[PDB]
Amino acid sequence: CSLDQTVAPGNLTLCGNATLFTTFRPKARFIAPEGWMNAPMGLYQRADGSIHAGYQSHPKHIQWGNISQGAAYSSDFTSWTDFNGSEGYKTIWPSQIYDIRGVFDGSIIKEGIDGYPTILYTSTSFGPLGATLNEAEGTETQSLAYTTDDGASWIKLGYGAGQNPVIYEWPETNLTGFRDPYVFQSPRLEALLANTTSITNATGDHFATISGGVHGDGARLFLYRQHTTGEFIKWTYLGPLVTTGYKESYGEWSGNYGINFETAGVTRLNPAGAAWDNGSDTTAVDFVTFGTEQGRADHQNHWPLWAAVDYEVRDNGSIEAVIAYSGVQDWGRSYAYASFPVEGYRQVSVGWIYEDDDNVILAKQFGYQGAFTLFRDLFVKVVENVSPSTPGLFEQASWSTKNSTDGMSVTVTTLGQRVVPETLAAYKGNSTVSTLAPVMLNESAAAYTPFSSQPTDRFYALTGSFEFGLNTTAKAGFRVLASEEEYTDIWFDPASENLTVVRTASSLIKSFGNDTELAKVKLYEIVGAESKTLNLTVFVDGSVIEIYANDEVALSTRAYPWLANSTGAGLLADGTTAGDVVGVSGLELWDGLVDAWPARPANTSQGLVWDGPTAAMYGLFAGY
Amino acid sequence: CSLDQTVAPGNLTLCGNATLFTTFRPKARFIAPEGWMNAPMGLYQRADGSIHAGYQSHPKHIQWGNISQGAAYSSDFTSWTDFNGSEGYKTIWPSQIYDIRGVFDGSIIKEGIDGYPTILYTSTSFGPLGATLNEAEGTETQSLAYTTDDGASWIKLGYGAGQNPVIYEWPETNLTGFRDPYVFQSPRLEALLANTTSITNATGDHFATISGGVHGDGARLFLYRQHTTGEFIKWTYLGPLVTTGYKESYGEWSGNYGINFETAGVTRLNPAGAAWDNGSDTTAVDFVTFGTEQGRADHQNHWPLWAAVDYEVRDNGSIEAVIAYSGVQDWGRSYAYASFPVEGYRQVSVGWIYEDDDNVILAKQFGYQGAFTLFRDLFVKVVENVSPSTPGLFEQASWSTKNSTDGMSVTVTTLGQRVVPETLAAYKGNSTVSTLAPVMLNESAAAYTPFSSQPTDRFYALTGSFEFGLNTTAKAGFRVLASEEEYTDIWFDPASENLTVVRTASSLIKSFGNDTELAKVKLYEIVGAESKTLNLTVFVDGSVIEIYANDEVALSTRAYPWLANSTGAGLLADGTTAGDVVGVSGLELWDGLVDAWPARPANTSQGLVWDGPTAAMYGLFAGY
Ligand SMILES: *[C@@H]1O[C@H](CO)[C@@H](O[C@@H]2O[C@H](CO)[C@@H](O[C@@H]3O[C@H](CO)[C@@H](O)[C@H](O)[C@@H]3O)[C@H](O)[C@H]2NC(C)=O)[C@H](O)[C@H]1NC(C)=O
Ligand SMILES: *[C@@H]1O[C@H](CO)[C@@H](O[C@@H]2O[C@H](CO)[C@@H](O[C@@H]3O[C@H](CO)[C@@H](O)[C@H](O)[C@@H]3O)[C@H](O)[C@H]2NC(C)=O)[C@H](O)[C@H]1NC(C)=O
Ligand SMILES: O=C(O[C@@H]1Cc2c(O)cc(O)cc2O[C@@H]1c1cc(O)c(O)c(O)c1)c1cc(O)c(O)c(O)c1
Ligand SMILES: O=C(O[C@@H]1Cc2c(O)cc(O)cc2O[C@@H]1c1cc(O)c(O)c(O)c1)c1cc(O)c(O)c(O)c1
Ligand SMILES: O=C(O[C@@H]1Cc2c(O)cc(O)cc2O[C@@H]1c1cc(O)c(O)c(O)c1)c1cc(O)c(O)c(O)c1
Ligand SMILES: O=C(O[C@@H]1Cc2c(O)cc(O)cc2O[C@@H]1c1cc(O)c(O)c(O)c1)c1cc(O)c(O)c(O)c1
Ligand SMILES: O=C(O[C@@H]1Cc2c(O)cc(O)cc2O[C@@H]1c1cc(O)c(O)c(O)c1)c1cc(O)c(O)c(O)c1
Ligand SMILES: O=C(O[C@@H]1Cc2c(O)cc(O)cc2O[C@@H]1c1cc(O)c(O)c(O)c1)c1cc(O)c(O)c(O)c1
Ligand SMILES: O=C(O[C@@H]1Cc2c(O)cc(O)cc2O[C@@H]1c1cc(O)c(O)c(O)c1)c1cc(O)c(O)c(O)c1
Ligand SMILES: O=C(O[C@@H]1Cc2c(O)cc(O)cc2O[C@@H]1c1cc(O)c(O)c(O)c1)c1cc(O)c(O)c(O)c1
Ligand SMILES: O=C(O[C@@H]1Cc2c(O)cc(O)cc2O[C@@H]1c1cc(O)c(O)c(O)c1)c1cc(O)c(O)c(O)c1
Ligand SMILES: O=C(O[C@@H]1Cc2c(O)cc(O)cc2O[C@@H]1c1cc(O)c(O)c(O)c1)c1cc(O)c(O)c(O)c1
Ligand SMILES: O=C(O[C@@H]1Cc2c(O)cc(O)cc2O[C@@H]1c1cc(O)c(O)c(O)c1)c1cc(O)c(O)c(O)c1
Ligand SMILES: O=C(O[C@@H]1Cc2c(O)cc(O)cc2O[C@@H]1c1cc(O)c(O)c(O)c1)c1cc(O)c(O)c(O)c1
Ligand SMILES: O=C(O[C@@H]1Cc2c(O)cc(O)cc2O[C@@H]1c1cc(O)c(O)c(O)c1)c1cc(O)c(O)c(O)c1
Ligand SMILES: O=C(O[C@@H]1Cc2c(O)cc(O)cc2O[C@@H]1c1cc(O)c(O)c(O)c1)c1cc(O)c(O)c(O)c1
Ligand SMILES: *[C@@H]1O[C@H](CO)[C@@H](O)[C@H](O)[C@H]1NC(C)=O
Ligand SMILES: *[C@@H]1O[C@H](CO)[C@@H](O)[C@H](O)[C@H]1NC(C)=O
Ligand SMILES: *[C@@H]1O[C@H](CO)[C@@H](O)[C@H](O)[C@H]1NC(C)=O
Ligand SMILES: *[C@@H]1O[C@H](CO)[C@@H](O)[C@H](O)[C@H]1NC(C)=O
Ligand SMILES: *[C@@H]1O[C@H](CO)[C@@H](O)[C@H](O)[C@H]1NC(C)=O
Ligand SMILES: OC[C@H]1O[C@](O)(CO)[C@@H](O)[C@@H]1O
Ligand SMILES: OC[C@H]1O[C@](O)(CO)[C@@H](O)[C@@H]1O
């Protein structure tokens, strides 16, 4: 096998295991040392202020199985250190009858068993497991473990009556799934339920949701409440928090609710970040974030969504979360977002970016699959002085509108997402920064214009503000990972309101996905303005392209160009004329980013293994 | 609940857990500290000469499940010490996908992985498991672990290709079972196969049998050979060693071969003990020992059997063991016999004695279930100068006959079993011994005659030689655990050739089994003798009654009298007259025996637990 990246790629399926380990690999983000990873899990801020991040992990394999928690820590979300114990970087693994099929997603009770951080996780055992299969009760249960050494190891409660698993009864029949327990405190929900606690007897200070659905009848998020403060065995089922319809869609701005929820969480935000009021803060908004399955024809049939909700108290002492508006957390190849509280009134969200090799053609040659997104602060985005003539404004699809008293302006509210400032500062400070001259894209603009400074490798960030006429039909954006023969084009088209990533030329290697990514972006036009602005930030990190628009729209995707010189970048322009002009300013190239894993060598492969003929016999894991 | 043993028993099902722990409990034999035990496993003589004994174990439960190896050691088979590690007295437990359903029976490779003692055991996973169910491949596999600290702990090989499990392919389709690997060296089999090794390429110095059968078509013992000396991953299937018919019986002296084998082993014996010749010792005989299932209407549908076999070499380089004669290892409530080699050319066999509470009425009140038999030396029993007029002699049912040259006498050969001399010496030396005067049982003999010295508790041994007329119709034997109201009668009836244990009066507690035990005993009449002798030894140990006749016939059973004074013993006589007389001599009472577990307190209960509602959900174990 040839690794000559100055000529066309050969038959790369002849290459050995992990021979392509460093070729496309992200360097500036959270990723496992090697092998398979998927969903973030067990996220919490430790007593010293550092961040503990777990992830679904299958070392020395490139497909899912024996799923375990791998873990690492960081003081700044950006530079990480692996745990290293008897199971390497793993800290929780299948070990008991109740979890032998996989230690699935879980979340952290900060002050749990004997006061220690405690994880509530989905413990899986034998039987069909999946939204499209006939799953039975017991296959997915919920279990506890706690740590006395701040995440280096976890001790599970014993198996049995009054111990693990702690939640095992299905709250309704014919579930499509029953997993991903999300533990949270909520002054809001406590205040709302305070007059109903004699009906249910549940008076604890922790709530937990479990994600699932009902066969034939749509997804469900089930709400539980800790029965008694300071005690963690008994969790009382209150009722369904979120109920959606079988493949129901709230519209073009909102994905599709599919048939089953995964990795759902509940938070409360205000314009500054996390909100811990009981309802009294009128600027605060209740949100649910959730993945949906089987409501999408591509992207592994998965939508990572969010909804702003209004809580109502039911007669039986439960809560209905009524969806007020509903959006998309990321429009690309990402899923399984988790959020967790951080000091200084923050709620931080992170997801998993899958590869674009769905037929598993070069997975073994990679020697790993998957990475995280960047860590994102959540907040309520507020846009004042919005013009009522903004096209489609009053659909209020993934946003809310509040008219001024005179009816001449609107205040828009939606979910804000922005990369955590610790990462932006570290990235910028460690990079070679080029501040580029502003550019008018007019009749003289080429289709592609390389920046006056170019990246030196596949690790960089771009930023720019694109100013468009209110009635423009021009398109503009950024080309990245570009040589003459390979390139990835990121376009915004204000007339259609579509942000696209065109990947028909992203790689000479034909086995990788090449479908066009698409996100909807609403440019809220400002009263008195004669133009509208798209602020676009793009992170290029090995094969990851992660795009942020206006601290609101995120789109993560993959590009795998073969050629060593497919690293360039510049401006894209289409239909720009003397009359239809696009002004581009605030242009910066951050070349290099940071090495997110300073203790790791470049090649952290430990080889790949096969589980042997018993993998097919047990029928649980692919085995490689 | 009342524990007053001077009055009739109340409703003992009202008693708490382990309140009857010491009431019926053996003291002088191998038994777990508490909870459920079954089959012996992992038996081997350690480097210091001590004996390591494992057993199938489920602590803090009184039914089978999560089956593990519990273990202890002894320098004399008699006084034992528990291992004590992180899992108490357990040393191997379910921990991996391949063995999570249970660590079933296994046997020892004395010089295995890196030269260490190594166990090959049945690792079980999910799915229907049983001879009467539709079991599938993978549910039962065979796996390796080794010990670097002579049995205090075991390290399993890793899961995967070229590692555990090491044997997983079914050698034939539609197996009724696939377990209990028995590893052994055999100069005999090596000599027989030496001209066929180019056909199979299997040239290792270890063989292994796996016990099972084929649905609808009877039991099978499958023979494997280690592929290469010094290497323990590859075991080559040669062919079926023993093939028997669906519920076939060799006759009244031989039990029934049922539908499936369990815990089968292979040995070679001569008149002094174990034989390690290649075929050249003409006094040596090849034997197979094996349990059978579903060929019996009672005794949990289980026969512990043995067969003398003649090996034949097949064209494909495998061995057929042709049954020459076939017997019963124990006629009572015992099963799962294992044998292992011991220094000084010995082969030692031990089994499991189950309780007689098959409806589980007082199991929780006991707080334990099960014990071992005594440890038994195996050898070829030889009886010279046998009269050809011995009734039924030439059926050669569970014995062989060789005529003298003149046809006037016969040499009888069969499987001998006798309690290991270390135990007999320790028992006798620690007991208060009463040597009793010989007794003629004639017209004046009462039905029951108490011995002139009586036991002081439920821990004693009796011995006696009963001399019968050749044409007697009299019956005689021993009554044990006897007061006026409760007693257990052990009768021999030479005319019918039946040894019986009548248990209609064994206990006032009606929930225990009361069926009559029966064994066949052949009294080989000696040329010129005018009488025939039954040598009977009986061990009474809590609730265990273990009977040995003529170093040949064993019968283990249970009696649970309530009354504190139901400990007496004496002679039984029926149909003895002036003309039909039974002479009883060599009479001894050994009162007390030994405390087999000197470091254990009397009550080693640690309470019982329930597995909770998930036990029924997983459907693998009863859960208590
Ligand atoms: C490279 O990694 C693989 C693990 O992915 C190492 O093990 C090999 O794994 C492949 C599957 O990826 C196994 O192939 C399978 O073989 C069976 C038949 O033998 C076939 O039925 C399946 O469809 C599949 O082809 C392969 O047997 C297995 N090889 C082993 C265990 O030796 C492989 O060893 C790694 N290579 C190196 C040099 O480290
Ligand atoms: C005495 O030992 C038992 C374990 O055998 C301890 O746990 C209890 O176990 C029994 C089963 O033996 C459980 O009963 C079951 O309850 C469910 C319904 O609640 C019923 O569906 C079943 O048919 C069966 O009756 C019992 O719940 C369980 N009790 C527990 C966990 O508290 C028992 O605790 C031990 N007692 C003492 C004082 O230690
Ligand atoms: O979310 C939890 O606290 C909230 C977030 C948070 C944080 O990030 C760091 C910190 O210094 C304090 C802190 O107080 C938050 C909080 C504030 C309140 O006013 C309140 O009533 C509440 O229940 C909560 C939480 C979760 C837990 O699982 C837990 O056991 C606990 O004690 C607390
Ligand atoms: O039908 C599947 O299992 C069977 C039905 C079933 C159930 O209804 C409840 C339960 O407690 C266990 C359970 O095991 C069954 C099973 C059947 C088989 O034939 C088999 O090979 C197997 O591994 C197991 C199946 C299908 C699947 O597609 C799948 O991914 C899976 O894990 C399992
Ligand atoms: O906190 C911001 O607004 C406040 C909260 C808020 C809301 O939750 C919903 C809503 O209908 C209106 C609204 O007005 C608030 C506000 C308060 C002020 O004192 C102020 O000067 C202002 O412009 C506004 C904010 C944050 C921003 O990041 C921002 O860009 C902005 O224009 C405003
Ligand atoms: O279940 C069907 O699609 C799923 C539901 C769905 C939706 O509600 C809106 C939407 O924008 C896309 C969409 O894709 C879903 C889907 C799921 C899959 O697993 C899949 O393989 C696929 O092609 C697609 C379906 C039903 C049909 O009746 C049909 O004819 C068809 O081709 C497909
Ligand atoms: O302008 C509104 O029309 C539609 C939405 C829309 C958009 O999202 C983006 C865009 O580039 C153009 C656009 O034109 C749409 C439209 C709808 C019509 O019925 C129509 O005749 C037309 O010319 C054009 C509008 C405004 C609103 O505020 C609103 O609530 C609504 O339902 C609709
Ligand atoms: O885009 C503008 O600057 C460019 C981008 C940029 C930045 O992101 C951060 C920063 O520290 C400095 C900075 O200098 C850039 C720049 C580069 C040149 O070579 C140049 O000639 C120039 O006028 C400028 C801009 C915007 C403005 O709003 C403005 O009024 C102006 O004069 C210029
Ligand atoms: O020897 C270096 O790492 C070791 C090899 C290695 C691997 O093969 C696969 C893998 O999954 C992880 C991995 O970590 C190893 C390692 C071991 C240590 O003791 C250590 O302190 C460390 O940072 C790491 C090294 C070399 C380097 O060149 C380097 O810059 C560095 O930080 C470290
Ligand atoms: O049965 C095994 O040896 C036999 C019994 C035995 C013993 O009890 C103690 C002892 O001092 C030696 C000993 O030699 C036995 C033996 C004798 C031979 O002449 C022979 O050819 C043979 O293979 C064997 C055995 C099993 C094993 O599993 C093993 O790895 C091994 O090395 C040996
Ligand atoms: O039918 C039994 O299992 C089902 C059939 C089956 C198989 O054919 C192969 C296999 O790989 C797994 C497997 O799981 C199946 C299963 C079905 C169920 O409905 C169920 O509740 C369960 O625990 C499991 C069964 C019956 C039994 O009587 C039994 O003791 C047992 O453990 C299992
Ligand atoms: O070793 C015993 O016999 C030897 C072995 C043996 C056999 O295997 C089968 C057989 O057909 C006959 C047979 O004759 C052997 C024998 C050898 C002698 O030197 C001898 O004096 C004798 O009586 C006999 C033995 C052991 C005994 O325990 C015993 O009671 C007894 O009478 C004899
Ligand atoms: O399978 C039947 O018995 C089993 C085989 C068998 C034998 O071969 C000889 C013998 O001495 C006893 C004997 O007991 C077996 C048996 C197994 C059981 O599981 C059981 O519950 C039982 O009563 C007994 C059976 C068949 C029949 O055709 C029948 O009518 C019946 O009542 C029973
Ligand atoms: O004596 C033999 O008869 C039968 C077997 C036998 C036994 O086991 C114990 C017993 O108390 C008595 C007994 O009488 C049986 C017997 C069979 C008959 O056909 C018969 O006419 C008779 O009177 C009585 C005999 C001897 C043998 O040596 C032999 O091989 C055989 O098949 C049979
Ligand atoms: O049964 C016979 O002894 C009795 C049992 C027995 C034993 O088992 C071992 C031992 O060390 C001594 C021993 O003394 C027993 C005995 C007890 C008496 O009270 C007594 O009067 C007597 O003659 C005897 C016997 C057998 C004989 O073969 C014999 O010739 C004889 O005189 C006597
Ligand atoms: O305290 C005694 O044992 C402990 C209690 C106990 C139990 O409750 C349940 C059980 O499964 C085992 C068990 O073993 C315990 C024990 C602990 C030790 O440290 C020790 O050395 C020992 O021999 C044993 C004791 C008392 C006694 O009276 C006695 O004679 C004795 O040997 C030991
Ligand atoms: C990039 O590499 C290719 C092949 O090595 C070459 O054709 C091309 O001219 C190079 N430089 C570019 C596109 O700037
Ligand atoms: C470089 O990145 C590291 C790791 O996140 C960070 O701690 C450091 O401050 C950065 N350097 C700068 C901003 O100069
Ligand atoms: C044994 O105990 C019972 C009841 O306590 C009593 O009736 C009997 O006489 C006692 N002694 C015997 C049988 O020797
Ligand atoms: C060898 O022959 C026997 C008897 O035909 C057969 O049962 C066995 O399976 C054969 N061995 C093989 C196929 O390895
Ligand atoms: C008593 O039994 C112990 C334990 O087996 C044994 O070592 C000792 O020799 C026995 N005492 C005798 C025979 O006097
Ligand atoms: O790895 C299993 C985990 O991944 C998810 O399926 C999301 O893709 C979660 O619902 C689950 O806990
Ligand atoms: O506990 C399981 C073990 O017990 C047996 O069934 C014998 O009764 C063995 O065949 C098996 O290994």
JSON list of C-alpha atoms in Angstrom, two decimals, chain A residues 1-3 5 12-13 15-25 362-368 509 512 562:
[
{"chain": "A", "resi": 1, "resn": "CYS", "atom": "CA", "xyz": [0.00, 0.00, 0.00]},
{"chain": "A", "resi": 2, "resn": "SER", "atom": "CA", "xyz": [1.26, 3.46, -0.98]},
{"chain": "A", "resi": 3, "resn": "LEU", "atom": "CA", "xyz": [0.88, 6.52, 1.27]},
{"chain": "A", "resi": 5, "resn": "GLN", "atom": "CA", "xyz": [-0.09, 11.98, -1.00]},
{"chain": "A", "resi": 12, "resn": "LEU", "atom": "CA", "xyz": [-6.40, 2.05, 0.09]},
{"chain": "A", "resi": 13, "resn": "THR", "atom": "CA", "xyz": [-8.35, -1.05, 1.21]},
{"chain": "A", "resi": 15, "resn": "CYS", "atom": "CA", "xyz": [-3.43, -0.85, 3.48]},
{"chain": "A", "resi": 16, "resn": "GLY", "atom": "CA", "xyz": [-2.84, -2.38, 6.91]},
{"chain": "A", "resi": 17, "resn": "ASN", "atom": "CA", "xyz": [-4.61, -1.60, 10.15]},
{"chain": "A", "resi": 18, "resn": "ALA", "atom": "CA", "xyz": [-4.06, 1.97, 11.37]},
{"chain": "A", "resi": 19, "resn": "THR", "atom": "CA", "xyz": [-1.74, 2.81, 8.41]},
{"chain": "A", "resi": 20, "resn": "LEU", "atom": "CA", "xyz": [-3.98, 5.85, 7.82]},
{"chain": "A", "resi": 21, "resn": "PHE", "atom": "CA", "xyz": [-4.06, 6.77, 11.55]},
{"chain": "A", "resi": 22, "resn": "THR", "atom": "CA", "xyz": [-2.63, 10.28, 11.25]},
{"chain": "A", "resi": 23, "resn": "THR", "atom": "CA", "xyz": [-3.80, 11.09, 7.69]},
{"chain": "A", "resi": 24, "resn": "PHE", "atom": "CA", "xyz": [-7.26, 12.54, 8.43]},
{"chain": "A", "resi": 25, "resn": "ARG", "atom": "CA", "xyz": [-7.16, 12.65, 12.25]},
{"chain": "A", "resi": 362, "resn": "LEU", "atom": "CA", "xyz": [-11.40, 2.40, 5.41]},
{"chain": "A", "resi": 363, "resn": "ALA", "atom": "CA", "xyz": [-12.28, 2.13, 9.13]},
{"chain": "A", "resi": 364, "resn": "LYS", "atom": "CA", "xyz": [-9.63, -0.51, 9.84]},
{"chain": "A", "resi": 365, "resn": "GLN", "atom": "CA", "xyz": [-7.05, 1.51, 7.94]},
{"chain": "A", "resi": 366, "resn": "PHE", "atom": "CA", "xyz": [-7.94, 4.55, 10.10]},
{"chain": "A", "resi": 367, "resn": "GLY", "atom": "CA", "xyz": [-7.65, 2.47, 13.29]},
{"chain": "A", "resi": 368, "resn": "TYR", "atom": "CA", "xyz": [-10.27, 4.74, 14.97]},
{"chain": "A", "resi": 509, "resn": "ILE", "atom": "CA", "xyz": [-11.11, 8.87, -2.49]},
{"chain": "A", "resi": 512, "resn": "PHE", "atom": "CA", "xyz": [-16.32, 8.61, 1.58]},
{"chain": "A", "resi": 562, "resn": "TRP", "atom": "CA", "xyz": [-5.98, 12.64, -0.18]}
]
